[PDB]
Design a protein around this ligand. Structure first.
Ligand SMILES: NC(=O)[C@H]1CN([C@@H]2O[C@H](COP(=O)(O)OP(=O)(O)OC[C@H]3O[C@@H](n4cnc5c(N)ncnc54)[C@H](OP(=O)(O)O)[C@@H]3O)[C@@H](O)[C@H]2O)CC[C@@H]1[P+](CCC(=O)O)(CCC(=O)O)CCC(=O)O
Length: 260
């Protein structure tokens, strides 16, 4: 079986008490990576930390903070000053029409889903370079490959992060650091349960009916799972992915129709 070669390393995993971030944390812990996990809500984060500790043989430190604020980033970096692995993630922006998005709505989305990842990279990449090993994985969205009609804030902010990452990945590649993006299609998380319920109500169908329709519309016929998302993250973080950088890995069951 495949030794990812990262046992004993340390990962800062953002926005990881639930969903895709949690799947990444669990996958890294299963490969022996010590974790600092961040989310805003203490009780949920502490329960996730307990669950990961019990199922793995690694240290798990929970930091309850808002990763999109200076104080939150300072708290995360105080707990994890020199990570080998950084998984960037935060809550996504709200849906709507851009006629309703103030300058401050745009700034909030840019801060959460573009500038916060850039700042955490700025704070951690030189330590990785100095050690000759680093892995940075940004959780973005299929929206960067095909815009989502109601998510202009994501289409914009996450494409901005993607362009920045394209440049930085190539600049730091000679020092054993890779920077890649993981782009989820439709994944079976609590966030999607909330979205589907609101969409089903607006459409006059049941949420179970809408979920089944959305699954059938995806070529694979199902939603993605946090476990398989985390497995791809773990592979990117491994000693077997050192020649992969600046890449946008789309996990979507074939939903995006572009050849590239
Ligand atoms: N599932 C999914 O399908 C997706 C998830 N997405 C993003 O990936 C992040 C994680 O998303 P997911 O893991 O699903 O969210 P979940 O709620 O389960 O977990 C969140 C954890 O983050 C903690 N947390 C939140 N905020 C902070 C903070 N400020 N500080 C610290 N921790 C924080 C929180 O904890 P708290 O802080 O305590 O609240 C939880 O621990 C996310 O950016 C999402 O947008 C990417 C793609 C898809 P799409 C459908 C794409 C297609 O169809 O092709 C497009 C979304 C977009 O383009 O924007 C969802 C569409 C919709 O939503 O209608």
């Amino acid at each position: 079986h495949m030794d990812l070669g990262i046992a004993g390393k340390t990962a800062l995993v953002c926005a990881a008490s639930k969903g895709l971030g949690r799947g990444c944390a669990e996958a890294l812990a299963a490969e022996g990576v010590n974790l600092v996990i961040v989310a805003r809500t203490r009780d949920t984060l502490e329960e996730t930390a307990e669950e990961i500790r019990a199922a793995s043989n690694v240290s798990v430190t929970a930091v309850a903070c808002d990763i999109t604020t200076p104080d939150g980033r300072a708290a995360a970096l105080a707990a994890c000053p020199q990570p080998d692995i950084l998984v960037n993630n935060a809550g996504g922006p709200p849906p709507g029409d851009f006629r309703d998005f103030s300058h401050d709505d745009w700034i909030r989305a840019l801060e959460a889903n573009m500038l916060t990842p850039i700042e955490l990279i700025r704070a951690t990449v030189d330590g990785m370079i100095g050690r000759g090993f680093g892995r940075i994985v940004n959780i973005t969205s299929s929206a960067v490959k095909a815009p989502i009609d109601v998510l202009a804030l994501s289409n914009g902010a996450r494409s901005g992060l993607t362009g920045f990452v394209a440049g930085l990945s190539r600049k730091v590649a000679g020092q054993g650091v890779t920077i890649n993006n993981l782009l989820p299609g439709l994944f079976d998380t609590d966030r999607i349960a909330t979205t589907l319920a609101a969409s089903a109500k607006a459409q006059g169908v049941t949420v179970d009916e809408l979920r089944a329709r959305r699954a059938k519309e995806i070529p694979a016929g199902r939603l993605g799972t946090r476990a398989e998302f985390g497995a791809a993250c773990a592979f990117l973080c491994s000693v077997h992915a050192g020649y992969i950088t600046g890449q946008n890995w789309l996990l979507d069951g074939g939903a995006y129709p572009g050849t590239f």
